[PDB]
Symmetry: D3
Subunit: 174 residues, 6 copies
């Protein structure tokens, strides 16, 4: 159970703990199930909508959807389901999904000796990668029903820190 052993980490310093759920490039919707302490394959997504980044969550946080706050974790090679890591916060994708706020914190591994910690801020990523992530989350439910998801904005690390802190308060309330 990750939400009892692991804390959110050093939110003020931008180094947080993240549990990975979905390897980049997978069209398997995998989710940590808090009740069972296990990873569940909710569904198979359309192959054209494979995840453009690794997809994870922050332990001991609560968003508007009742689940832990989501993480877009960018690496060169995909991460397996179920490993956790310390990750550097570099921004936030403000996002609405079916009427509920479901923001996603953008992260890289805190210690990345493959790119030498090259991504320290959101605009260090190629602009075209941001556009692809934006397109993915704007459209990944379109084959069921279009127009229910909306990437609202991209925020820096300080706005991401504020989002994480609010999600921490929700967890502490519950």
């Amino acid at each position: 159970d990750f939400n009892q052993i692991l804390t959110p980490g050093d939110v003020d310093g931008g180094i947080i703990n993240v549990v990975n759920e979905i390897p980049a490039g997978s069209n398997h919707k995998i989710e940590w199930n808090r009740k069972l302490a296990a990873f569940q394959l909710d569904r198979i997504e359309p192959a054209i909508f494979a995840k453009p980044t690794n997809y994870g969550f922050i332990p001991q946080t609560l968003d508007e959807d009742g689940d832990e706050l989501d993480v877009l974790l960018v690496t060169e090679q995909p991460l397996a389901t179920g490993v956790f890591l310390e990750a550097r916060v570099i921004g936030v994708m403000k996002f609405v999904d079916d009427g509920e706020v479901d923001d996603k914190i953008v992260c890289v591994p805190a210690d990345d000796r493959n790119n030498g910690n090259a991504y320290k801020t959101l605009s260090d990523l190629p602009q075209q990668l941001i556009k692809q992530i934006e397109f993915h989350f704007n459209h990944y439910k379109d084959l069921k029903k279009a127009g229910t998801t909306k990437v609202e904005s991209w925020g820096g690390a300080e706005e991401a820190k504020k989002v994480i802190k609010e999600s921490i308060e929700r967890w502490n309330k519950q």
Copy 2:
């Protein structure tokens, strides 16, 4: 898994399945119930990579004390250790070393890549069935041939009866 997960909605044909072996792997991985951990029992011959994902239904028992196995069919392989709700589409009636060792045939219950295209065994390519049958008829042949036999392919109602029988065995032990 056998403490948190139940077999699920067997009457509705939507069961819980825990994946052990990704499709295409020649690693014989099994959930060790005594230790609550996944064990690589052995490396199989590469020519006998699993033709489908391979898993089990929690809280079920074969007649000989074995878990009730699941052949889970997907386009891309599933990792070891993920669980899912799965649609029962049939049963491979199977004998291994004289022991009944049936395998429930399943797909993910929510498949938005093919739009839940497979609901019965006849929805699958008959040639996929023949490959699965060949695999389980021969995968032990390099050690000793003739010890495994695919007896028949049953529909979803027969599969449900096999699941319910295995639920009873679990309950009684």
Copy 3:
């Protein structure tokens, strides 16, 4: 040089010759360069728009873009660039790309002993696969400029044969 060694094949019988350019799942836009008689990587596409099928062409055909008529070849595992095969015609995607007609013939290998020739008509494919292909071709240029590509409609094998015969005539008269 495939346009000299290969004819279109048995168009009336629905078994044609197809030369593969792009493996399914690749975001590399590879095209047969008829002038040089070699395969050219035109550009890298966004990774979110990896090709949903193999992409190929029919020898000795001309569509309106001045290239050979395109083929969407559906297989379980991707086909390498530069291999040719006899393929069963199962339909056609009517398509307009940046002002011009650029229809694509939908094909499977003529001899498929993996699925036992399971796909003979478009209705044999999962509808959700067609919907994914439609979405891909409706959106794959959106990061440069949206609204320039349109999947007009889908036809069956006799409609596809008519398009092939029209492109054979354009080749002969070039």
Copy 4:
């Protein structure tokens, strides 16, 4: 056209030229088409019968089936279709396919700095690998009709050289 400028190579030295057709692990039956000078996907094979080695041919040879002599090329990672190499001859699989002889020369790359040229005879390979290759070629047409293929025996490099020389004579005539 590989048969125009590529020769069979140093048959007496056991270092021959091989053109690869099928990557190890592929279920795509790809064949060099001599008349067109291009690689043709003849058919998709059952996924359970993916090739257990790379599959290639010797230029300017002819076996009894009318094509160039086949090569089983063993490597740790698959080779792409259409690459040629100098290969060390380590044995021959004597083979009958649907009535006619279709022997296959067993080779490794002549220059392997990953394993330090570890394989010089068939006995240097894991015996279980040979048994897997034999099973594959004994069964790969079974879903169409069983019993039409037979691995007759395995020979060493000298029998392989004799087979190659007979195939060079067929090409010349």
Copy 5:
């Protein structure tokens, strides 16, 4: 938690229990976190230094570095993080990592029906494979700071058993 459900196994018979941490070919440094009972991605390594074998540990053992004794597990295809297996001991790599002893037991799966248990000693492996493993561990920290790691020697199964028993005593005395 592996250190409570698993013993080291049949050390005297050379068949020990091993828990896999890093799949061969991965540049993700994954470690079993004993305090959290979970696998942690410590850092991304340079891709040029992808692990040449699977990398794991023996439960209920301690080496000089304070972690469980390491294992180099050689397989034809990589093993996933988090699986455990009975492994045959075939050798030991004697190794110093920044002034600390950190030997690694060389193992293969005890039941290998793909190669028919072809590897029983180090001399059964290609000598070039050993040289590559040696190169890797002599150089994998070089982009940070070179000259801090040294493969000291390669021992057989009997020396490996002695190393295992010493690590069992260290664990027992903790």
Copy 6:
């Protein structure tokens, strides 16, 4: 025959023609054989020395020894053997191999819509990627090293153009 159909391209403009021989991540040493006009697997390299980038050459150029002028082509996903492309020159790895100059032009695809043409100079790349490439070429013959393998410096695109133009002159004189 790529040396007859293709020219070096627009050297002054920095957009040249490149033929790919080796996919990134491959340990297969594949070379275009000018005598036969075909791609040859010269040898299997140690797996620990897989190519860190795609590896290719510029048509109609010669090193001072008669070697074709090599290309390090950087992409996110490996390119297949045998395709050619227009590529942007972004730098040069000055390199000495066995007592001879053996420079390698650093390139990216000229039209990269996955990263949005993010890389125009060497400094645009993560500097840790450069250090990994440097380590690779300094050490890839270490298992049996018969001569120098030394990266002498990293040059910009203007120095790279001078190297290309010198190699065009040698080719024309031959």
